[PDB]
Amino acid sequence: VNLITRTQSYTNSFTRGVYYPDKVFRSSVLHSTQDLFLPFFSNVTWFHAIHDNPALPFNDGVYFASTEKSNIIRGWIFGTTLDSKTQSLLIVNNATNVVIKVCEFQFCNDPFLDVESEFRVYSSANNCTFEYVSQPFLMKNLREFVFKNIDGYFKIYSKHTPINLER
């Protein structure tokens, strides 16, 4: 059922989006790295959803940012056609666990949670080839995430920062 509307505004990213490229300790040195980074002083399409074609292209990677506190946001969906003819992700978070499945989901036009049944996300999945369960990622505050994939490896970075009253 279509009940979501969306508007877009534009703003800048300033000096944000730097992550540790490798898990090796370094101190008092300047290191030159080459990888997928968010360039300085770039567009960031501030999306506002109120209650719609939210099939946003992925391209090389995605930097996601959220400043809300009510935790109305949860989980993500990934795919190439968002249909049952191709496999898709179902990264979904709640207050206790995160489940990650790769399967041929039949995604609806707009997916959501009734809150707590995901019947409106997909109709039925048949051939699943990957399942995973872990502790949920999400825990006046800004939450930043980086998603990318290289050589069949999906990598997710995150960070939590305190932000004062700034628009």
């Epitope: 800048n12 002083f41 770039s42 567009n43």
Partner: nanobody, 114 residues
Framework: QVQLQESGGGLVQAGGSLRLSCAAS????????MEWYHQAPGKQRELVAT???????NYSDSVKGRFIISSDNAKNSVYLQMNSLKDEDTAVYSC????????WGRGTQVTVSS
């Protein structure tokens, strides 16, 4: 193609209102500063208003209370609001922007009759 293009000039009687607008082909985010200069026939250039990247805004002594300079992040441009014009406001205006070198524009000959 030229980067900074200006518009909003013409003849306007005293006490009216007008809108000056200069648009840049490059994104207005990296320009790091945008200023409006004006000069009158036979006089030297003086700064009217300036806005930096962060959001700090500054004006001149004879500019406060009548002029407002602001930019929107939809079409990359900077707008100046001409309010409570007098005879001495008649001049030629040009906007300036410096990322790592200065870029200038021309035009916008505004005249006030009294």
């Amino acid at each position: 193609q030229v980067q900074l293009q200006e518009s909003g000039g013409g003849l306007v009687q005293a006490g009216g209102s007008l809108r000056l607008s200069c648009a840049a082909s490059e994104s207005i985010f990296r320009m790091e500063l945008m200023e409006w200069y004006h000069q009158a026939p036979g006089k030297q250039r003086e700064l009217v208003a300036t806005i930096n990247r962060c959001g700090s805004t500054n004006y001149s002594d004879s500019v406060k209370g009548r002029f407002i300079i602001s930019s929107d992040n939809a079409k990359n441009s900077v707008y100046l609001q001409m309010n409570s014009l007098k005879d001495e406001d008649t001049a030629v205006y040009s906007c300036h922007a410096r990322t790592w070198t200065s870029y200038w524009g021309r035009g916008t000959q505004v005249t006030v009759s009294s």
